[PDB]
Write a protein that binds this ligand. Structure first.
Ligand SMILES: Nc1ncnc2c1ncn2[C@@H]1O[C@H](COP(=O)(O)OP(=O)(O)NP(=O)(O)O)[C@@H](O)[C@H]1O
Ligand SMILES: Nc1ncnc2c1ncn2[C@@H]1O[C@H](COP(=O)(O)OP(=O)(O)NP(=O)(O)O)[C@@H](O)[C@H]1O
Ligand SMILES: Nc1ncnc2c1ncn2[C@@H]1O[C@H](COP(=O)(O)OP(=O)(O)O)[C@@H](O)[C@H]1O
Ligand SMILES: Nc1ncnc2c1ncn2[C@@H]1O[C@H](COP(=O)(O)OP(=O)(O)O)[C@@H](O)[C@H]1O
Ligand SMILES: [Mg+2]
Ligand SMILES: [Mg+2]
Lengths: 761, 116, 232, 80
């Protein structure tokens, strides 16, 4: 089968659409196909065809043939491709134009950027010689480039008669009609298309299925008989691309658009907002189909408790009354952007009003890479920009911050070249003003000179940590697999026995053994969305936002099924209800524990949202969290042993060079019952000693060479610098274990207390 | 020198927020930059705009923005934004909401650049 | 006349150098290889793969040369030194309140590179035991959790170092010792005979000394005396 | 205990299904034989495997404590 959640975006193959690539012929109205394409399309020599491109752009071009051309390609030159707003590797449809209808009252005027310092007349040396009897098809608005000498003069077709398209025959009576079109025409560079929104391929798919389908295919909905939803409510972190997505999906569809703004309506005096909204709605309805994008809807319809204002209440009531009246079914779709789904007046979430809600979350790694590649298609990049590493380095950056990062990188590149340019004037040299390519160093400087904006956001992620780099723990791995993956991957087989699996696991053991690693690995293997929540975060967000997070965390986990929710450090809150407890802190801790217990009794009822918690000491944990349901399943994470220690040592040193005389098995036998993280610290200390030795050697060699300049470059070059046995000998002697035998004895005592099945062996 | 930003292809930033201790030189820095660069400096004081009658404040702000966009290049040194655009934890004053929304609308409609 | 902004935050590069302290040679080496190298020679570590640790917890007897060590390492690294004590957080919790701690880290983030310093952690890092919590006098429920939340976000930033100091290593909560939050622990010992000799020389470096005074005799006399007592 | 037996039985079922699928994939000449999936009931082996890991939720002292708390309300035993 296939995943149909994003089944609209992909193209469908057809013998009517081909691919665009480069060619040889350089006439402004010719494109070269292969004769097999003409045979399939029943086209012949000299026919004038119609080419349709991105953002509802089209032109007319003469199609010729050549054997060099491939059948699935069109060999489009640069000028026409620029007019089609496309690039090599895209899909372009082809049709035939029956009506040429040579124009009579055509208008041809040039562009300002090419007539600056023009050689002179263009009528008798640029226009007439190359367009009289040339029979070149012309479409209104095309920016075509012609040469009557060394200078290339762009021309914009202001007007034609017939208006749409024609051919430049000698019947055309217009000359160069004086006015050169300024570059401002390209200032409105066809607003925004679809390639200008990237990084989100499911939210845009949902928006397309909710908007572009009702406004372009009412037949399907009428046949099924379903009432399509009107209200849509985008939301997400601020500066993440909500207005951009709305503009992209409303300008590409070609429907009537109406962009109401929050502060724009609010700024007007009382008694006018109530009229402005009604006039806006009555105008939008009159031009079906219509889209009403109400930006910053949180400003005009805030939470009623948070305002207590008469005019605010009146405008909210007016908005509600107008919104309930959109049941005319006249193709009016309302899209209210916001950034907090909990700050909107809840009366707007009822049935009939804004009901579909879409979360434009922060982009992931591929999303950040795509945003960067979209934004850096104009900067004069150098030949050494490696955007993959830049995307991997940046975490928590929303799209706006990536745009700011690109701008800062370009500014740094300009600043690095401040030595030559003067201050009284500029344009010292075109060549000096050229070059200045932005290299990787500028990007690194800008990345170090900027800050993110979404560090506190809950990143619903899909971790890349696989089964490996954990080591040992085969029994725990297989038990976790049987507990998690099977109810998700094969839910129908459990119905045969009718025994619904539980939806909770507890991880108890010594502090630091791979407790979170196993959860992340199983989430990765199941490919389910992972959410990491810690006790301190909940405790501080309680006072930050009056406990309006704990329900929200479960809501965001439930709206992304399948999901492996993870609770870390339950020891802060999940302690047993002692009789000596008191104070505001203890009250808040117990309130959080009770709220968590209340929510887990509804989130574990159904919906198959998995919950895994981890605690450092199991006996202090409240006994409520071990009743049937909730967190019934118990798993103990042991201290790794010799084989497991060898595995973890290999995993830690996999990413670093190692000397061949370092017997890692001798290190495994050297250690006994270490706390997992101490092995990583040992590796880090060995790395630090090796770095110190290497830098000391390099500094000494540089000083020696500087002291004796006549000593030319010898054969001595920096080697692999593997971590040799001296580093490990110097590091292990500084080892300091983290868990004493008392703690492991306490854990084993608790484990044997639970393990009453020891007599069943 | 807009030529650099035309050649390399970046929109320069169109807003600066100076913040620091009270009486530490913010207004002096702004005035020195304005007088050194030779631009048509324009000053919008905080309390001065906030002290006028209702309806007059929005008129003054709109007039100032239009005048700045009329004599490009220009600078609009809004002074003490704390007084006219306070943090909205909770407020009901209609004039305050109107002036904040007017400032937001003008700032977002300024995106037609023209060196402001 | 009196200043109007005396209570403002401190961002500077302290003038204390290695020669202002004596006897802590091994700790000098360790702090140099822990702080200076990860910032001044970063690309080597990615060459070796494993990332360094951000955060050092000093523990030792009261008045034995802890703050001077942070000043010296900040001077060597030439990074801004932001110092925030213990009681300042508690008194700001009833001033700027909840956001205040966040602001500090923001001023640490905007002033990179930096060596943030937290002295007197014993007042706020009391262990979250059975008796923990309490009302507004029990800041260990609020400021400790806020500090942990803020500190867990600094791992992304390449060079904003965090250093804490405490005279009560027993009462320090265990959440400040997991990796990612003050990973390394350094013991700052009481100066010994050679160390006391060096510290007396450093203290009297600024003033003339009579010819009849033997520093060695004073050092042997003052065995078991901390640095503050030599200064006294 | 019953849920553990069910989970082990489902593990056996999926292992058998994937083994049959791999056997059919190897030498695809093997057509659809009569070896159709059976009822796959929970066997005594699964129950015996599960029994060796089941814990004990009630200790030996809580039962006596509850019995005493009930017996202090049953002071008519000596006259019954
Ligand atoms: N997913 C994205 N793809 C491409 N560009 C993006 C994306 N997200 C943001 N941008 C860029 O971000 C810049 C401005 O962001 P914009 O989308 O206008 O902010 P917003 O989130 O709509 N603001 P608000 O309505 O105040 O929350 C533009 O130049 C966009 O190109
Ligand atoms: N950094 C400075 N350099 C030179 N003169 C200064 C500086 N800071 C302040 N002054 C002088 O101090 C006086 C008052 O400073 P002024 O710049 O008017 O205050 P301000 O910082 O604008 N006040 P506030 O609105 O509270 O930030 C003037 O005479 C300035 O020239
Ligand atoms: N067996 C192991 N395999 C891989 N990494 C390990 C192992 N044991 C410890 N570690 C390392 O120790 C660090 C912390 O261990 P963890 O179990 O996450 O501690 P905690 O349970 O306190 O979160 C992790 O970053 C991990 O890389
Ligand atoms: N190595 C040293 N060299 C010179 N003075 C020292 C040294 N160690 C401590 N001191 C003295 O200790 C005082 C500062 O102590 P401090 O580091 O603040 O301890 P604490 O943090 O416990 O208060 C200074 O006045 C200084 O004279
Ligand atoms: Mg918006
Ligand atoms: Mg001032």
């Amino acid at each position: 089968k296939k995943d149909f959640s994003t089944a609209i975006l992909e193209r469908k193959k057809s013998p009517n659409r081909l691919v665009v690539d480069e060619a040889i012929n350089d006439d402004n109205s010719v494109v070269s196909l292969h004769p097999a394409t003409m045979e399939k399309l029943q086209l012949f020599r000299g026919d004038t065809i119609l080419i349709k491109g991105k953002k509802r752009k089209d032109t007319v071009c003469i199609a010729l043939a050549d054997e060099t051309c491939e059948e699935p390609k069109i060999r489009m030159n640069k000028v026409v491709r620029s007019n089609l707003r496309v690039r090599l590797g895209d899909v372009i449809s082809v049709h035939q134009c029956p009506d040429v209808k040579y124009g009579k009252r055509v208008h041809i005027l040039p562009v300002d950027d090419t007539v600056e310092g023009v050689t002179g007349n263009l009528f008798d040396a640029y226009l007439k010689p190359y367009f009289l009897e040339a029979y070149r098809p012309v479409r209104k608005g095309d920016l075509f480039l012609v040469r009557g000498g060394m200078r290339s003069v762009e021309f914009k077709v202001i007007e034609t008669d017939p208006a749409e398209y024609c051919v430049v025959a000698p019947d055309t009576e217009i000359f160069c009609e004086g006015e050169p079109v300024k570059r401002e025409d390209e200032e409105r560079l066809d607003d925004v298309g679809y390639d200008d929104v990237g990084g989100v391929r499911k939210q845009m798919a949902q928006i397309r299925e909710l908007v572009e389908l009702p406004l372009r295919h009412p037949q399907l909905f009428k046949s099924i008989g379903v009432k399509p939803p009107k209200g849509i409510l985008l939301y997400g972190p601020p500066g993440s691309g909500k207005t951009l997505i709305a503009r992209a999906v409303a300008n590409e569809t070609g429907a009537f658009f109406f962009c109401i703004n929050g502060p724009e309506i609010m700024s007007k005096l009382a008694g006018e907002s109530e009229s402005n909204l009604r006039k806006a709605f009555e105008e939008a309805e009159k031009n079906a189909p219509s889209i009403i994008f109400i930006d910053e809807i949180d400003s005009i319809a805030p939470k009623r408790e948070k305002t207590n204002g008469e005019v605010e209440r009146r405008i909210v009531s007016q908005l509600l009354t107008l919104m309930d009246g959109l049941k005319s079914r006249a193709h009016v779709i309302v899209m209210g952007a916001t950034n907090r789904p909990n700050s909107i007046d809840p009366a707007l979430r009822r049935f009939g009003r804004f009901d579909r809600e879409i979360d434009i979350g922060v982009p992931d790694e591929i999303g950040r890479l795509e945003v960067l590649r979209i934004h850096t298609k104009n900067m004069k990049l150098a030949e050494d920009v490696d955007l993959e590493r830049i995307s991997k380095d940046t975490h928590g950056y929303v799209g706006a911050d990536l745009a700011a990062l690109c701008t800062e990188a370009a500014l740094q590149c300009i600043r690095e070249k401040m030595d030559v340019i003067d201050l009284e004037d500029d344009s010292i040299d075109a060549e000096i003003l050229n070059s200045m390519a932005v290299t990787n160093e500028h990007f690194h400087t800008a990345l170090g000179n900027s800050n993110p904006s979404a560090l506190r956001e809950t990143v619903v992620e899909v971790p890349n940590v696989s089964w490996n780099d954990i080591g040992g723990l085969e029994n725990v791995k297989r038990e976790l697999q049987e507990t998690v993956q099977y109810p998700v991957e094969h839910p129908e087989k459990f119905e045969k026995f009718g025994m619904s699996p539980s939806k909770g696991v507890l991880f108890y053991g010594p502090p630091g053994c791979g407790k979170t690693l196993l959860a992340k690995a199983i989430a990765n293997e199941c490919q389910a969305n992972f959410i990491s929540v810690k006790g301190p975060e909940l405790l501080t967000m309680w006072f930050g936002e009056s406990e309006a997070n704990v329900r929200e965390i479960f809501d965001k986990a439930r709206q992304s099924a399948p999901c492996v929710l993870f609770f870390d450090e339950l020891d802060s809150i999940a302690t047993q209800r002692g009789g000596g407890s008191g104070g505001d802190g203890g009250g808040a801790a117990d309130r959080v524990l009770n709220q968590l217990l209340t929510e887990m009794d509804g989130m574990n009822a159904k919906k198959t949202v998995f919950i895994i918690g981890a605690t450092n000491r199991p006996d202090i944990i409240d006994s409520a969290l071990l009743r049937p349901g909730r967190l019934d399943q118990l798993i103990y994470i042991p201290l790794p042993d010799e084989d497991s220690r060898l595995n973890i040592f290999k995993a830690a040193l996999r990413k670093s060079p190692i000397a061949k005389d370092v017997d890692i098995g001798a290190l495994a036998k050297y250690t006994q019952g270490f706390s997992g993280a101490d092995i990583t610290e040992i590796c880090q200390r060995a790395c630090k000693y090796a770095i110190r030795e290497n830098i000391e050697k390099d500094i000494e060699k540089e000083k020696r060479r500087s002291e004796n300049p006549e000593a030319m470059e010898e054969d001595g070059v920096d080697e692999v610098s593997e971590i040799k046995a001296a580093h490990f000998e110097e590091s292990m002697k500084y080892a300091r274990r983290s868990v004493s035998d008392a703690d492991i004895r306490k854990y084993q005592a608790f484990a044997q207390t639970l393990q009453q099945s020891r007599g069943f062996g």
